[PDB]
Amino acid sequence: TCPFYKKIPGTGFTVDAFQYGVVEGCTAYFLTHFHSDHYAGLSKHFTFPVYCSEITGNLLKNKLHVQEQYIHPLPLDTECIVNGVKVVLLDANHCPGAVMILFYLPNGTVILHTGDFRADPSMERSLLADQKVHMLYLDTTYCSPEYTFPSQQEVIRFAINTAFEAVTLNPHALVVCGTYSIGKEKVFLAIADVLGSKVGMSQEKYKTLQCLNIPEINSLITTDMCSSLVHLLPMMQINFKGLQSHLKKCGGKYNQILAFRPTGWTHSNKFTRIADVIPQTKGNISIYGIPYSEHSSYLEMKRFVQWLKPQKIIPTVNVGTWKSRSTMEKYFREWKLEAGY
Numbered sequence: 001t002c003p004f005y006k007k008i009p010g011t012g013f014t015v016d017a018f019q020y021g022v023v024e025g026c027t028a029y030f031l032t033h034f035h036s037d038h039y040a041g042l043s044k045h046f047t048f049p050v051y052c053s054e055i056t057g058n059l060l061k062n063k064l065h066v067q068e069q070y071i072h073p074l075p076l077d078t079e080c081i082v083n084g085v086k087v088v089l090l091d092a093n094h095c096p097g098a099v100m101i102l103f104y105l106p107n108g109t110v111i112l113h114t115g116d117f118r119a120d121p122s123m124e125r126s127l128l129a130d131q132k133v134h135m136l137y138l139d140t141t142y143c144s145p146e147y148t149f150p151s152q153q154e155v156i157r158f159a160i161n162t163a164f165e166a167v168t169l170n171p172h173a174l175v176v177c178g179t180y181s182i183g184k185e186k187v188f189l190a191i192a193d194v195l196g197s198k199v200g201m202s203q204e205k206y207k208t209l210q211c212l213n214i215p216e217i218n219s220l221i222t223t224d225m226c227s228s229l230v231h232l233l234p235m236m237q238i239n240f241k242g243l244q245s246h247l248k249k250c251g252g253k254y255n256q257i258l259a260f261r262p263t264g265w266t267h268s269n270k271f272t273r274i275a276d277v278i279p280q281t282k283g284n285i286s287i288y289g290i291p292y293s294e295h296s297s298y299l300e301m302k303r304f305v306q307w308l309k310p311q312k313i314i315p316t317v318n319v320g321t322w323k324s325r326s327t328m329e330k331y332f333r334e335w336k337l338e339a340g341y
C-alpha cells in the first residue's frame, strides 16, 4: 500500500507512486524523474494524469509508450495550477529532467518535495528564497557524516586527464564507460570531447539520450561503434570477463581497455583523495571506480536544510529500518540546534 511519505496532505496528489495500483484518493500522479525505482508501474495502459518535466515527459511517451493525452509536462521555474493548487518545478541537479516540486496548499502551508537531488548553493537563488517551507520531503540517501565526496567538476577533471593520457600513450586503447539509467552523462561526453571522438552505444541507449534535448547531441553520440573510441556498456558488463568479451568483439581494432564505473560513494573516499585513486588491473584491462554522485553528500544536505529552516522534515530514503530512521532524526536535531531554528 502507498507509503505515507509519497502522499501530499490536503491534496489529491502522490509523488513517485506508480507501483501500488490505483491509490485510494489520488486525482494526480507526480513523477520527479525517470529512474526505475520511481517510475515502476507506468505503462501504455496507465490512464491517470501524470505531471512531470518536459524531459521526463519525452521519455514516458517514447520509452514506456504512455499515451500522450495523460502526460502533462510543465516548464521549470513557473507558477502553474493543478486541480486548483499552485505548483512549481525546480531543477534537482540529479539526472536529466529531474525536478523538485513546491506545493502551495490552499490553507497556506507550503511543501517542498526534493525528489532525488544533489543540493547546491545555486538553489538558494531560485523561487525557494522568497518564502517559508513548513514540510520538506528530503532525499536522505547519504545522510551520514562518513559520506563525503568531491565535486562533480574535480571527478571529471580526473577522468579527462586519465583518459587523455592513456590514449595518447597507446592510440590503440579503447575507453569504456558504464551506465544503467539516465544520468552521469557528463562523464562519457567530457571524455569523448577531449579525445575528438563520439560516444558509441546500442540503439536503445541512443534512443534514450535523443529524448533529452542535449545541445548538439547528434555531434556527441552514435550507434556506429567502429568509428568511436569511447564505448558505453551496461554497468553489469564492467568487470574483467565482460570487458575481455567486448574487446573480442572489436576485431583487433583495439589491444587495451581503460574503463570507468561511476559509482555514488565507495569507502575508498574515507581514506583516499581523488588525485590518489588507482584502478584494478588484470592483463590489458584497467577498471577505475570514480565517486561521481548525483545525490547530496552529508555536508551539502546539511547546509541545504539549515539554509531552508523547514518546520518538519520527512525522510524519503533509508526509511526501512529503525536504526536508520533513528540515526537520521538525531542529525536533524543537531542541524536544528546548531542553526538555532
Ligand code: NI
Pocket (backbone or CB within 6 Å): 033, 035, 094, 116
Ligand atoms: Ni534517482
